[PDB]
Amino acid sequence: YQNIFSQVQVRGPADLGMTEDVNLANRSGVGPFSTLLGWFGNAQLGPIYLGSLGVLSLFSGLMWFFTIGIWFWYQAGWNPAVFLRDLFFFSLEPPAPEYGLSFAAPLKEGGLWLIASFFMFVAVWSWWGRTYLRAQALGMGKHTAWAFLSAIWLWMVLGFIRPILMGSWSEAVPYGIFSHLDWTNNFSLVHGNLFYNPFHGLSIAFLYGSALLFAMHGATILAVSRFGGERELEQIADRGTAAERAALFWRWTMGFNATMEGIHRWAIWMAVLVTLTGGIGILLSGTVVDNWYVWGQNH
Amino acid sequence: DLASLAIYSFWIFLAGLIYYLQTENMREGYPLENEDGTPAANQGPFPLPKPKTFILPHGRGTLTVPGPESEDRPIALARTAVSEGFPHAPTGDPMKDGVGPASWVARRDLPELDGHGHNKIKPMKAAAGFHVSAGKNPIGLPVRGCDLEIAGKVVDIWVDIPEQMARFLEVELKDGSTRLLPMQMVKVQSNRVHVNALSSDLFAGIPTIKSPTEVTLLEEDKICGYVAGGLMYAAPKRKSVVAAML
Amino acid sequence: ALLSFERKYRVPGGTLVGGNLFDFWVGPFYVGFFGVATFFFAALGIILIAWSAVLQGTWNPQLISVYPPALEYGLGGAPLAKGGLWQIITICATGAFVSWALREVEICRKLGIGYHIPFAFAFAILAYLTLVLFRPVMMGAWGYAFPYGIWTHLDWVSNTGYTYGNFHYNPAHMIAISFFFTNALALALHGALVLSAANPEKGKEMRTPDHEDTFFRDLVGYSIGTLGIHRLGLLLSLSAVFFSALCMIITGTIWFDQWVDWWQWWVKLPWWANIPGGING
Numbered sequence: 001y002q003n004i005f006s007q008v009q010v011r012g013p014a015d016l017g018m019t020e021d022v023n024l025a026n027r028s029g030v031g032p033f034s035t036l037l038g039w040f041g042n043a044q045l046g047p048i049y050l051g052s053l054g055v056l057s058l059f060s061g062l063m064w065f066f067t068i069g070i071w072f073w074y075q076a077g078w079n080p081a082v083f084l085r086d087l088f089f090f091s092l093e094p095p096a097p098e099y100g101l102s103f104a105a106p107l108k109e110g111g112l113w114l115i116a117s118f119f120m121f122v123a124v125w126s127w128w129g130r131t132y133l134r135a136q137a138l139g140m141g142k143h144t145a146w147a148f149l150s151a152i153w154l155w156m157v158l159g160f161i162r163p164i165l166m167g168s169w170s171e172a173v174p175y176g177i178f179s180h181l182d183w184t185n186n187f188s189l190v191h192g193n194l195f196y197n198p199f200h201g202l203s204i205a206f207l208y209g210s211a212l213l214f215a216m217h218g219a220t221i222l223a224v225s226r227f228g229g230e231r232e233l234e235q236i237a238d239r240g241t242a243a244e245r246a247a248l249f250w251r252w253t254m255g256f257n258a259t260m261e262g263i264h265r266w267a268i269w270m271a272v273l274v275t276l277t278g279g280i281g282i283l284l285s286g287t288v289v290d291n292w293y294v295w296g297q298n299h
Numbered sequence: 300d301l302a303s304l305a306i307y308s309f310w311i312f313l314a315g316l317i318y319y320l321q322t323e324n325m326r327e328g329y330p331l332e333n334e335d336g337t338p339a340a341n342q343g344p345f346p347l348p349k350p351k352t353f354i355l356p357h358g359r360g361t362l363t364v365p366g367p368e369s370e371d372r373p374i375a376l377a378r379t380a381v382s383e384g385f386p387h388a389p390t391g392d393p394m395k396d397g398v399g400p401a402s403w404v405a406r407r408d409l410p411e412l413d414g415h416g417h418n419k420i421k422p423m424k425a426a427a428g429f430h431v432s433a434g435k436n437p438i439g440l441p442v443r444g445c446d447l448e449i450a451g452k453v454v455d456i457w458v459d460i461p462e463q464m465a466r467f468l469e470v471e472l473k474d475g476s477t478r479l480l481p482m483q484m485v486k487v488q489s490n491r492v493h494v495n496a497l498s499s500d501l502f503a504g505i506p507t508i509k510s511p512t513e514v515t516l517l518e519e520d521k522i523c524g525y526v527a528g529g530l531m532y533a534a535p536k537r538k539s540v541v542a543a544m545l
Numbered sequence: 546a547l548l549s550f551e552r553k554y555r556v557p558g559g560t561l562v563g564g565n566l567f568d569f570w571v572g573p574f575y576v577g578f579f580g581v582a583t584f585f586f587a588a589l590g591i592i593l594i595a596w597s598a599v600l601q602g603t604w605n606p607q608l609i610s611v612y613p614p615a616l617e618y619g620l621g622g623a624p625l626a627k628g629g630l631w632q633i634i635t636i637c638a639t640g641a642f643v644s645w646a647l648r649e650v651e652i653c654r655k656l657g658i659g660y661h662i663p664f665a666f667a668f669a670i671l672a673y674l675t676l677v678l679f680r681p682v683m684m685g686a687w688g689y690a691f692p693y694g695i696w697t698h699l700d701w702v703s704n705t706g707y708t709y710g711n712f713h714y715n716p717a718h719m720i721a722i723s724f725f726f727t728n729a730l731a732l733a734l735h736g737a738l739v740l741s742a743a744n745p746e747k748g749k750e751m752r753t754p755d756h757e758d759t760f761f762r763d764l765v766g767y768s769i770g771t772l773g774i775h776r777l778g779l780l781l782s783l784s785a786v787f788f789s790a791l792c793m794i795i796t797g798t799i800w801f802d803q804w805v806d807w808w809q810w811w812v813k814l815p816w817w818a819n820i821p822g823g824i825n826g
C-alpha cells in the first residue's frame with residue numbers, strides 16, 4: 001500500500017468550520033459530497049464565504065470573461081459552429097501604438113481590450129483583499145496574501161507597469177489562447193533571446209526547483225504517513241518519529257535537512273521566487289535592456 | 300547599468316535568504332552531538348537562531364525552540380566500532396525496546412484535539428453519523444499476517460473526524476483483546492485484510508492503549524513505530540510472494 | 546556529528562548488497578554499496594569531462610562543453626574527441642543517478658519508511674534518459690542528444706525548438722507547462738497555509754488543521770485536506786515531468802513539421818471546416 005489513493009472512504013456530519021471572528025452570516029450552505037474526490041482528498045464541497053468583496057470580485061471577474069466572450073462571438077459572426085472551431089484563434093488585441101496610453105481607442109480597435117483589462121484589474125485585486133481578510137478573521141498569519149502578491153507582480157508588470165513605462169498600451173498581452181503564445185515568442189525575439197536574460201534563467205531555476213521540492217516534500221510526507229506525518233501542525237508543536245525519520249532520510253542522503261515547520265519556509269520561497277525574479281526580468285526588458293545578447297556581451 | 304546592479308543585489312539577497320532559511324531549520328535537533336551524547340566539536344557554519352515560542356491551545360502550555368533535547372529515555376543500543384560512523388546494534392529486542400525502524404518518540408501522552416477541543420480521532424462506533432461511504436468495508440474481516448496466518452478480525456475503524464478519514468483498524472486477537480493497526484500499513488482485500496509488516500505472532504506485542512475510546516500521541520507513536528519495525532525485524536517470518544500467491 | 550535524536554536510528558541493516566561491508570556513515574552521509582558506486586561514477590564522469598576541457602583548450606565553466614557524436618556517426622561509437630567522450634560520460638551519469646536512487650532505497654529500508662522519494666526521483670532520470678537515450682535512438686543518431694555545457698545546452702534547446710516553428714504549439718508541451726505552473730501555485734499555497742496556521746497573529750494561540758480547512762473553504766469553497774495536498778504536489782510534479790518526456794519523445798519521431806500545423810485537424814473537422822467566416826473561414 002502506497003497511500004496514493006484511499007482504500008476505504010468514511011463519512012460523517014458536514015463540517016461547518018471554525019467560527020473565530022468570521023461573520024457566519026456570509027457563509028453559504030454546505031455543498032454535495034464527492035465520492036470521486038474522496039479517493040484523493042476530502043469529499044466535502046463547501047461551504048464558501050461570500051462577503052461583498054468576494055461578490056465584487058466574482059462580478060468583475062465574470063464581466064472580464066463576458067467582455068472577451070462577446071468580442072469572440074463578433075469575430076465568429078454569431079455562428080456557434082465557427083465560434084467553436086476557431087475558439088483558440090480568436091484574440092482581443094490592445095490599442096495600436098498610435099494611441100499611446102490614451103483611452104480614446106474605438107471599441108473594435110482596443111477599447112474592448114481596455115474595458116476587459118479594467119474588469120480583470122478589479123477582479124484580481126479585490127480577490128487579493130479577500131485572501132487577507134479571510135485570514136485576519138481566523139487570526140492566522142498573512143502568508144497566503146504575501147505569496148499571492150508575488151504572482152500578482154508578474155501579472156502587473158506584463159499588462160500594466162511595463163506597458164505604462166514603455167508609454168503604450170500596445171505593449172501589453174492580448175486575450176487569446178494562441179495569440180498570447182505568439183506574443184510570448186515574439187517578446188523573446190524582439191529582445192534578443194530571453195535565454196540571455198539572467199532573471200529569466202533564475203525564474204526557470206525556481207520553476208524547476210518547485211517541482212523538485214514538492215516532489216521531494218510530497219513523497220516524504222507520504223513515506224512517513226505510516227507515522228501520522230501529514231499532521232504537520234502537531235508534528236511542529238510536538239515532534240514525532242515521523243518528523244525525525246523524514247529529517248534523517250535527507251541528512252543521510254544529502255548531508256543536511258529541515259524541520260516540519262522549516263520545510264514549509266523553503267517551499268514558500270522556492271515558489272514565490274519564480275514570479276518575483278520573472279517579474280524583474282520582464283520589467284527590465286525594453287526599458288533598460290533592448291537586447292540581452294548584447295547586454296550579456298558587456299557583463 | 301541598472302540591470303547589472305539588480306542581478307548583483309539579487310545574489311546578495313539570495314545568500315542572505317538561504318542563510319536565514321537554514322538557521323531557521325535548526326529549531327530542532329541542534330546542537331549536534333558525538334555518538335556518545337556529548338557536544339560535538341563541529342557545529343557547522345550556521346549559528347543557532349534566537350528562540351521562538353508557540354502558544355499551544357486547549358491549555359496545553361507552550362513550546363520554545365531551540366531548547367534542550369526532549370528525548371531522555373534509555374536507548375537499547377551499543378557501539379560497534381571504536382571510531383565514529385558505524386552502526387550501534389540492539390542490546391536486546393529492538394521491537395520491544397523501540398530502536399531502529401521501530402523507534403518511537405515520547406510525544407505528549409494526550410490525544411490530539413480538533414479546533415473545538417474534541418478528540419481528533421475516535422472509534423467509528425462512537426462517531427455520531429460516520430459510516431463507510433465507499434470501498435470495501437473492512438469491519439468483520441479476518442486479518443492475515445506476513446507469515447500467512449490469521450492474527451485476528453477487524454471489529455471497528457478509527458476515524459479522523461475533522462478530516463473524515465480512516466486512520467486505524469481495530470483488530471481483535473485470540474485472547475479477546477484488541478490492538479490498533481495503521482491504515483496506511485494494511486491491505487484491504489475482498490476476503491481479508493493483509494498486514495505485510497507483521498507476522499501473526501507479533502500482534503500481541505503491539506503497544507496497547509489506556510482507554511478503549513481514545514488514543515494519545517504517545518500511544519500512536521509507539522504503535523506506528525512498532526508496526527513499521529516489522530519490515531526489517533520480522534523478515535525471517537515473512538513468506539515469499541509465490542507462497543502468498545497460493 | 547549527529548542530531549540530538551539520531552542515535553537510536555543508526556542501527557545495522559537495510560543494505561541491498563554487500564551485507565555490512567559498506568553499512569556505515571561518514572559525517573552525516575550514509576554510504577552503502579550504492580554510496581561508493583555513486584562516488585565511482587561521479588568521479589570518473591567529472592574526470593572525463595575535465596579531460597574534454599583540455600582537448601577543447603579551456604578551464605572556464607561558461608565555456609566547457611562536451612558534444613555528442615555528429616549525425617554521421619549514427620548510433621555507433623566515436624573518437625573520444627569527437628563524441629566518444631560524451632558517450633562515456635553519459636554512461637557515467639546514468640550510473641551515478643541510478644546508484645543515487647538505489648542508495649535512497651537502502652536508506653528507506655533502514656529507516657522503515659515508504660519508497661516514495663526514490664520512486665519520484667526515477668521520473669527525473671527517465672526524463673534525462675528520454676533526451677539523451679530514447680529519443681536519439683528512435684531518431685537514429687546520438688547527434689540529436691544535447692551537449693553538456695551551461696550555455697551550449699540552452700543553444701540546443703533553442704535550435705531544437707525552432708526546428709518546428711514556435712514549440713509552444715506542441716500539445717503535450719502545453720499540458721506539461723500547466724502542471725509546472727499549477728505545481729508552483731500549489732507549493733506556494735501549501736507553504737503559506739501551514740505557516741499561516743503555525744504563525745498566527747502575534748500573541749495568539751497556534752491554529753489547528755481545522756483552521757487551515759476553514760480558511761480555504763471560505764476562500765474557494767473546498768479543501769483537499771492535509772493528506773491530499775501532499776498527494777497533489779507529488780502528482781503535479783511527476784505529471785509535469787511525465788508530459789515533458791512525452792512532448793519530446795514524439796517530436797521528430799512521429800511529428801516532423803511545424804507544430805502549429807498539427808492543430809489543423811480540429812479546424813478541418815467535417816461539420817465546420819468550410820463554413821465561411823471567422824479566422825479560418
Ligand code: BCL
Pocket residue numbers: 195200201202204205206208209212591673676691695696698699702
Ligand atoms: C529541462 C530542459 C532542458 C534544460 C533547460 C534549461 C533551461 C532553459 C534553463 C536551464 C537552466 C539550468 N540547467 Mg538545464 N536543461 C536540461 C537539462 C539539465 C540537466 C540534466 C542532467 O538533465 C542539468 C544538470 C541541467 C542544469 C541546469 C542548471 C545549470 C541551470 C539551473 C537549473 C536548476 O536550477 O534546476 C532546478 C534544480 C535545482 C534548484 C537544484 C540545484 C541544481 C544545480 C543548480 C545544478 C548545477 C549543475 C552543474 C552546473 C552541472 C554540472 C555538475 C557536475 C560537474 C556534473 N539542465 C534539459 C535539456 N536548463 C537555466 C539556466 O540558467 O541555464 C544557464 C535555464 O534557463
Ligand code: BCL
Pocket residue numbers: 124151152154155158183184185186187188193194195199200203204205207274275277278279281282702726729
Ligand atoms: C520563445 C519564448 C521564449 C520565452 C519567453 C518568455 C516570456 C515572454 C516570459 C517568460 C517567462 C517564463 N519562462 Mg520563458 N521563454 C522561453 C523559454 C523557456 C523555457 C524553456 C525553453 O525551457 C522555460 C522552462 C521557460 C520558463 C519560464 C518561466 C520560469 C517564466 C514564467 C513564470 C510563471 O510562473 O508564469 C506563470 C505565472 C503568471 C503569469 C502569474 C499569474 C498571476 C495572475 C494574478 C493570475 C490571474 C488569473 C486569472 C484571474 C484568470 C483565471 C482565474 C480562474 C479562477 C482560473 N521559458 C523562450 C526562449 N518566458 C515569464 C518570465 O517571468 O520571464 C522572466 C515571461 O514573461
Ligand code: BCL
Pocket residue numbers: 184185642669670672673675676701702703705706707711712713718721722725786788789790791792793
Ligand atoms: C525556443 C524554445 C521553445 C521550447 C523548446 C523546448 C525544448 C526543445 C525542450 C523543452 C522542454 C521543456 N519546456 Mg519548452 N520551449 C519554449 C518555451 C517554454 C516555456 C515558456 C514560458 O514559454 C515554458 C514554461 C516551457 C517549459 C518546458 C518544460 C515543460 C520542459 C523542460 C523541463 C523538463 O523537461 O524537465 C525534465 C527534467 C530533467 C531532464 C532533469 C533531470 C535531472 C537529472 C535526473 C539529475 C541531475 C543531477 C545533477 C547532475 C547533480 C549535480 C550535483 C549538484 C550537487 C546538484 N517551455 C520555447 C517556445 N522546451 C524540454 C523537455 O520537455 O524535456 C523532456 C525540452 O527538451
Ligand SMILES: CC[C@H]1c2cc3[nH]c4c(c3C)C(=O)[C@H](C(=O)OC)c4c3nc(cc4[nH]c(cc(n2)[C@@H]1C)c(C(C)=O)c4C)[C@@H](C)[C@@H]3CCC(=O)OC/C=C(\C)CCC[C@H](C)CCC[C@H](C)CCCC(C)C
Pocket residue numbers: 208209211212215216253254583586587590591634637638641642645662663665666667668669670692693694695696698782783786
Ligand atoms: C521528476 C520530478 C522533479 C525532480 C525530482 C527529484 N529530484 C531529485 C529527487 C527527486 C524526488 C531526489 O531524491 C534527488 C535528491 O537527492 O534531491 C535532493 C534529486 C536530485 N535532483 C537533482 C537535480 C535536478 N533535478 C531536476 C529536476 C527534477 N527533479 C524534476 C523537476 C533538475 C532540473 C534541471 O530540473 C536538476 C538539475 C539533484 C540535485 C538531485 C540528485 C543528486 C544526484 O543524482 O547525485 C548523484 C550524482 C552526482 C553527485 C554527480 C554526477 C555528475 C555527472 C557524472 C556529470 C554529468 C553531467 C550532466 C549529464 C550534464 C551537466 C551540465 C548541464 C549544464 C547540462
Ligand SMILES: CCCCCCCCCCCC[N+](C)(C)[O-]
Pocket residue numbers: 143146147149150153268272276
Ligand atoms: C512585490 C511582491 C512581494 C513578494 C514577497 C512576498 C514573499 C512571501 C514571504 C512569506 C512571508 C514570510 N514572513 C512570515 C516572514 O513574513
Ligand SMILES: CCCCCCCCCCCC[N+](C)(C)[O-]
Pocket residue numbers: 197198199200201202205209269270317
Ligand atoms: C532557494 C533555492 C536555491 C536554488 C538556487 C538555484 C541557482 C541556479 C542558478 C542558475 C541561474 C544562473 N543565471 C541565469 C542567473 O545566470
Ligand SMILES: [Cl-]
Pocket residue numbers: 141740744
Ligand atoms: Cl512567520
Ligand SMILES: [Fe+2]
Pocket residue numbers: 217221232264735739775
Ligand atoms: Fe507539508
Ligand SMILES: [Zn+2]
Pocket residue numbers: 413414415416417
Ligand atoms: Zn470538534
